[PDB]
Design a protein around this motif. Sequence first.
Motif, mmCIF file in Angstrom:
data_model
loop_
_atom_site.group_PDB
_atom_site.id
_atom_site.type_symbol
_atom_site.label_atom_id
_atom_site.label_comp_id
_atom_site.label_asym_id
_atom_site.label_seq_id
_atom_site.Cartn_x
_atom_site.Cartn_y
_atom_site.Cartn_z
ATOM 1 N N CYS A 180 -9.259 -3.771 5.946
ATOM 2 C CA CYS A 180 -8.429 -2.937 6.607
ATOM 3 C C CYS A 180 -8.786 -2.235 7.993
ATOM 4 N N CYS B 264 -2.502 2.690 4.450
ATOM 5 C CA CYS B 264 -2.576 3.414 5.683
ATOM 6 C C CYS B 264 -1.391 3.275 6.638
ATOM 7 N N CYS C 229 -3.453 -2.143 5.611
ATOM 8 C CA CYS C 229 -3.019 -2.156 4.132
ATOM 9 C C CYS C 229 -2.005 -1.325 4.106
ATOM 10 N N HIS D 38 -8.147 0.373 9.439
ATOM 11 C CA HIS D 38 -8.173 1.620 9.454
ATOM 12 C C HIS D 38 -8.937 2.342 8.446
ATOM 13 N N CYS D 39 -8.675 1.829 7.129
ATOM 14 C CA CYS D 39 -9.659 2.417 5.980
ATOM 15 C C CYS D 39 -10.952 1.975 5.543
HETATM 16 ZN ZN ZN Z 1 -6.571 1.108 5.103
#
Ligand code: ZN
Lengths: 241, 234, 219, 329, 280
Positions: A30, A69, A66, A32-33
């Motif tokens: 992902c 997020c 995902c 972001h995560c």
């Molecule tokens: Zn994420």
Amino acid sequence: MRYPSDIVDQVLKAGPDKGLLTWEGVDAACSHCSRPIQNGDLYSPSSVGAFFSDTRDLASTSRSICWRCVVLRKKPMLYGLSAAVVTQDGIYSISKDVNKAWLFTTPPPAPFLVVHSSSTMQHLSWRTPVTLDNRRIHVRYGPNLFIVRPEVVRKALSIADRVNEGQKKWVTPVYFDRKAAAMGHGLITRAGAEMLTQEEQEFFQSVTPGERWALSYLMHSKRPEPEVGECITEKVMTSLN
Amino acid sequence: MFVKQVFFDLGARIHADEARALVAKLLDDTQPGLVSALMNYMPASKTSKTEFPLVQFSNFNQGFALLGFGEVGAQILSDATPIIHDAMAKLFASRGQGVVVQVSSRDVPLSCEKRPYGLQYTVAKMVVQKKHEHRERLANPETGKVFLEGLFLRSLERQAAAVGMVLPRDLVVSFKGAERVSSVKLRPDSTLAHGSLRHAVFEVNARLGGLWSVGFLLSKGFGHINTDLQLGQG
Amino acid sequence: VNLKVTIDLSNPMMEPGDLLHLDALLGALRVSRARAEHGDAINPRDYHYDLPLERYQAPSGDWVFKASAFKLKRQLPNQMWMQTGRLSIVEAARHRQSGYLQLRAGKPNPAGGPFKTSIYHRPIVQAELTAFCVGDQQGIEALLSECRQIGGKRGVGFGQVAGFKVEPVAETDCPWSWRALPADADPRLVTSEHARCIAAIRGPYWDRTLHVEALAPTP
Amino acid sequence: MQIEVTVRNITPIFSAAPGSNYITIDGTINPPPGVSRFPLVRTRMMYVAADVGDGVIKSVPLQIVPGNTMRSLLRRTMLKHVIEPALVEKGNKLSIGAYATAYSGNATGNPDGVPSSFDEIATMRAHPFIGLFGGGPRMLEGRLMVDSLYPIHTNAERILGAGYENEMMSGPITQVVWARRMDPILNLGSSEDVEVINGGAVAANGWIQDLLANSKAAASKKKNGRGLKAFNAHEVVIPGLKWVWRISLDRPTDAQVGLVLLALNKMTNERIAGGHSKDYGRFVIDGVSLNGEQVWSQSGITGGEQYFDAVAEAIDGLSSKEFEQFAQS
Amino acid sequence: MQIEVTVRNITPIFSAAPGSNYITIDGTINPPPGVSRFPLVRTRMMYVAADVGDGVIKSVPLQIVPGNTMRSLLRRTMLKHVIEPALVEKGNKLSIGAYATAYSGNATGNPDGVPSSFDEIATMRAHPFIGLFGGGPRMLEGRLMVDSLYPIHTNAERILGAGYENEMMSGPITQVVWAFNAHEVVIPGLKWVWRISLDRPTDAQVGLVLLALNKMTNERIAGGHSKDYGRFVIDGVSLNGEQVWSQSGITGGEQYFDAVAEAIDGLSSKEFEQFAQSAK
DNA sequence: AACACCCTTTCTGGATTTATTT
DNA sequence: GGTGTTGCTCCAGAAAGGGTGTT
RNA sequence: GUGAACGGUGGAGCAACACCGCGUGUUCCCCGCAUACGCGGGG
Ligand SMILES: [Zn+2]
């Protein structure tokens, strides 16, 4: 628990938007995560927008997000988590100085996530690691990722109290900036150059930036007393829904 | 304490006593309380107070000036400045093309200290004669020296008491002389006149650090000058 | 085969946020040498582990280089450095009027977007840097002689080095375990400074997809 | 490819620094409360460890110009005196993303992640301008190291190795200067004879009346709106001293060195740091060393024929397509 | 663009500097003992690195007139002698806010933090006057740079040495006068040099600068007007390194004069109102 | 004919402060 | 054996909805 | 592949004035202490 986005389904009860695509093929992280998106996992293509100023904080170039997020990126989650500590039991506030004294001195014994805003509204939840240990705390303050050790904070506070004994007024041995921006952030003052020994001055000189930022809040004329922060789980939960 | 000095520039010079009558006339119809405060009138009647006048008109090259002694005197000027400026602008705008009226203000602190040496202070346009007895005392230099002597000392004491500060009671003043003698008329075209001294020089061991007024007819702008400009004159 | 590394710098350098391991700097230098040899179109992950250092093999894999993180001997008081990012709107206006820039928006927005103004602050330090590792000195010295800056923000001139020195020491003299260690690392190596966290124990330490459970000490 | 440039400022240099500092009418800075205090803006300054013959290696103050400022100055002069005319002559245009990436290094053109292959990374690092400065959504690394401006001072013995012992200055190199602002409406005399104002002598009296009313209200409240009168000070670096500027290029092609030399040649019509309205930041170049060899004369740079020929060849073929591909992909 | 002006004073030049300084019957300045102290007022001063001792560089004083006052003098003479009569003719009154904006930059003390549109910046930077001196509520950047007034002295060799190897004076250029308010002034009959620069200017703006320079000689530089200090004459004006000065005026660069004539022929008060207006 | 682009609301809690630069 | 006046002003946020165009 | 790589402290503003030298020619009204023999002072 493991990733910053686990709070989306563990601390608060949230579900996928059901308008997302299902991942097909080999897996990717992902953006972001940093959580892997395996086969059959719901996800959303990345359309961050021209006002997104956090390209340098992206974890990968998969351009996939995902479904957790997606919840983390909502406005209620952006302004509801401006200054808070996330634990399995619930969400608490660290906005006041007494709350910060409670958190950085005698912290709650659990895995948790600490975020503090430095501006009107910012992305902070998904780019800060969770803390698995109590004596090494990861705290995000705006564009800064800090590390705080409660033992060092306690020792510094005890030193400051010891040097202030027998004086009717309080004098700070060192200068600390609440915004962590001054050129003399962490300097030895003239008064602190006479009541501090050489080893104590060396101890104050060698301290991580996060501990300096915390001592900015905890070391002033009126010494705050530790008390727990206000529980804001239901407020955030009802604002999101 | 402190004395406030406010300067009004109309682009022309009008005398302080004439400026007092003009201000009385222009604001006679409306806001009588403000006029009474400026003119130190009695609360109920038109007759002025007998005590030391807090608000006294003064001299300015491009107009007239207002002096306010103490917190009350400064407050009166603070509330009166905009009204006076508006009245001046309205008066000068009706006739002619119209002038721009500018103002200026200062806060001069008052002080006095005793030193073991004489100091030189000159006074311009001071009134000394009010009754026949004063005229008789002015006839002979011996009996007139003491009269001017006590008049100067008592004027200093009265201003010090009115402004609210203590003054050392061991001062010794002396009078050197006066350049000229002239009369002062209370109202124009009135036979009655008051004797006055011009460019008189007085000598006190103490030093004075602000605006100080001596003699009679203080509110008409007579016998007051700044010691600070005179102290270490540039 | 046990030796110590000391670095002198003639310029304040950006204070590292996390531990700066010696093996990371050695890998950067080795990748630079590989780029100079084979060209710019190479895979850095092929050569970044070809270092002259021993590796500690924990139970169940999870190996880690026998190199520690740098420690600072401060010579200056701590100071803070400010930098700004801004895009000019007068030249932007002239270019938009001349057709050289293809913009249809009306006015700029300083709060965000292309014309955002940002201010950010970072601490700087001037210190002696020391570290410990196990390996061959002859191999280490050449790579370190190839290095000329240390720390971050190297493009604006921070952290110019003045000299370096590598010397051998005793087996008990050199602690190499002051580093990010695997969770299963032998309890003998783990000290009281090490605490549980999620961090990188190898490779490019900034890659968040490679972070694992680890025991690491605070700088 | 080390380039060392020596300059000499003819006007004061003023690089403002963050912070709230105050000065009195006298020279005392940041006085204890109870004195008349005026705002003051200082230059930029950093602490350095200067080793003296004592060996104490204590900390001393040094006045500098930050390296970010110099890097941006070089980028802007390259973009304005070289790239802009060459691109305009071909009738080319830039989108907002490409423009932002080229002129500032922003990534808002493609704010998501943009992957790039190793061949792709090499093909952009071979480009003259794109290789000199990186950035954009790719966040590529450039080949430029731009150091800060260092005055030739005894406090800079540590940064500057040797060979500068002569023509070296010692002592203070800064001064505090004062500025004022006046209200122009109050300057209107009673003689007036000004009719450009719409209201003539009535609007000015209204302005004065508003000033008086605001002053009266504030004075009553004491026992927000701001006028035009002002009195403040700022600190500058004195003119006439000489500085040292160093630029380093990492394995550069000939075209990139030629572009750097073209920018240096087209310099001296620009200014350093701020103070635009006061003509601050003027300078003249008195020496350029190219890997230890003096290549600067009275009129431009003499030498580096291969670099100049390569950059002249590389200027042709400069199209917007490469900028668009680096910006977006 | 890089205009250099050489001027001569016929009366003493005075520019009081904030601060406190003392003199003792003209004998000494700021003595360590507090004996026979008198107040003294100094002219503005500027430290410059210079070559003294034949090999070493030191900081030495130099008497100057600040560039802020020169920029204001330029603005006022150009606004009074050129813009004002053209504006007042054929009507075209200015509002009070526009007047304050034209004379002192901003019209109020608080600037709005909002930005301005691209079209407004483009049109204002092209105005013959507004483009020269910036400012306004949104703090527009002008294209005029005004330096300070330097005497052609041997102390300023590191500033202007190449241009003037000769015709440089030496020694003190200051005299103390008692009238008991004592101040120091720069002696008359001295040669000064003034540097002005513009970046990417139109021909109208250069013409306006030349027009202002023509009528500047009747003005005064700093000084106390009551004591008739500050009179000066203009000679030796050089434009981009070329001499364009005659005894009767400029007489050169005709394109700038034609452009400024056309520009001030069609000036209107609408631009002033648009620039001065604050969109708070 | 739908995504690209522009403009315009809106939402969130606390509390102190030093001084090696003609 | 001088003193009052001025004694700073702006800002460094992204999401969300609704209205418009290229094509 | 140095928790690295990318980032302009900027734009506008007069220190020199202000407070000093310049007109009135003789017994009229009010306020206190007294308690009128007079002292003090407001216009
Ligand atoms: Zn994420």
